[PDB]
């Protein structure tokens, strides 16, 4: 009989769905073939990026005395970091607002 | 019922529970994280497809994914993502 099923996410130590990522790579018209390690690598990278943004956003929410991450906190996390901001420079975060930034010459004497 | 409209919400929530056990996430931030995951997936997958095509490779392997990650992600973000992906692939290979 079939052995007890283990998700490839569990095999890889990931939260993100290696199986779903593999199916999206196969069905996404990216190549004729998709190697077995490709969805694992991609799920690991997506999970890493998600963890980084969610952790910075949770830090921002905690600093704002809020227990739930909101688009403002995601925006603050992304824009207060050069690497994330350059990754997502061309991106608009809905309901994210903008960083508070007033040019010095506008401030009163 | 309505048709099963899959998303990354549960995986992003699991990652949130790991990185910050006691904080939550609103629906709009949840949708933004879904959009982010989809966008980065599309970027890395498109870049990997282009790498394979440039090299006359029919297959997308973890090595094309690694190169695509190095090309798209900046600075230290790139090497940490590469470390994560390599660790996951090694663990998966060890089963």
């Amino acid at each position, epitope marked *: 009989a079939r052995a007890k099923a283990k998700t490839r996410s569990s095999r890889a130590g990931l939260q993100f769905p290696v199986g779903r990522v593999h199916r999206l790579l196969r069905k996404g018209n990216y190549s004729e073939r998709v190697g077995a390690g490709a969805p694992v690598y991609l799920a690991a990278v997506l999970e890493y990026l998600t963890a*980084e943004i969610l*952790e*910075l956003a949770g830090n921002a929410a905690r600093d704002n005395k809020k227990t739930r991450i909101i688009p403002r906190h995601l925006q603050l996390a992304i824009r*207060n*970091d*050069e*690497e994330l901001n350059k990754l997502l420079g061309r991106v608009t975060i809905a309901q994210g607002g903008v960083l508070p930034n007033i040019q010095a010459v506008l401030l009163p004497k | 019922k309505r048709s099963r409209k899959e998303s990354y919400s549960i995986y992003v929530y699991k990652v949130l529970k790991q990185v910050h056990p006691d904080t939550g996430i609103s629906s709009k931030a949840m949708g933004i994280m879904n959009s982010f995951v989809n966008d980065i997936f599309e970027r890395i997958a498109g870049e990997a497809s282009r790498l394979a095509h440039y090299n006359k490779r029919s297959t997308i392997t973890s090595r094309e994914i690694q190169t695509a990650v190095r090309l798209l992600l900046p*600075g*230290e973000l790139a090497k*940490h993502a590469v470390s994560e992906g390599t660790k996951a692939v090694t663990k998966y290979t060890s089963a």
Partner: single-chain antibody
Amino acid sequence: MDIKMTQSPSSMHASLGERVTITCKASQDIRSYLSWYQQKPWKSPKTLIYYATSLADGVPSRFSGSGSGQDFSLTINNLESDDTATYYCLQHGESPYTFGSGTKLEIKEVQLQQSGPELVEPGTSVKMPCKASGYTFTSYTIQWVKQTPRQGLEWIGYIYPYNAGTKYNEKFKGKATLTSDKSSSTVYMELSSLTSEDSAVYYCARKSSRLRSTLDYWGQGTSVTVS
């Protein structure tokens, strides 16, 4: 509520070529954000392990780390002559970064230029510069660490040149003030009202804004001495 970091062996001796284990115990859960630093005497610390398991660049596979949560360990397999130094665990999982007490071990291109020694009278102010080169200046925080023989390493604070953002250790509010200069790629530390306990070596250290990144490159250390 600071995370006190407890290194179990305060000192140890070992012959050449055998394994060594150093244990560092955290006061609270720090979620694998722990680093290990090797400091040979009179020289700046070099990072060995970051994210509690990952070797820093250029570190030989002889060094290895393990653990997560509150218990962490460092292992050196093939002891070589130069492995004699003081080893510090550094947690950066919570806002006041805390170094370990340090384990003295005895056996049988990024540049952060930092100014030379300083002699000052009490009540004065001093301005340690940290000229950084070999990397994109704005992308990495510059972290400042104070080293004394009585208190070990103490984390002062950091400046993020990308947005001039700062964080300071509560022990150094007012005492320290950090500023950046994008044009010269230089970071300056103010010390206000120098006092006797301020005689210490101050290191600027580069740390990426990535949460798992650690203090990776260090300045040579500015030895401030107050009369």
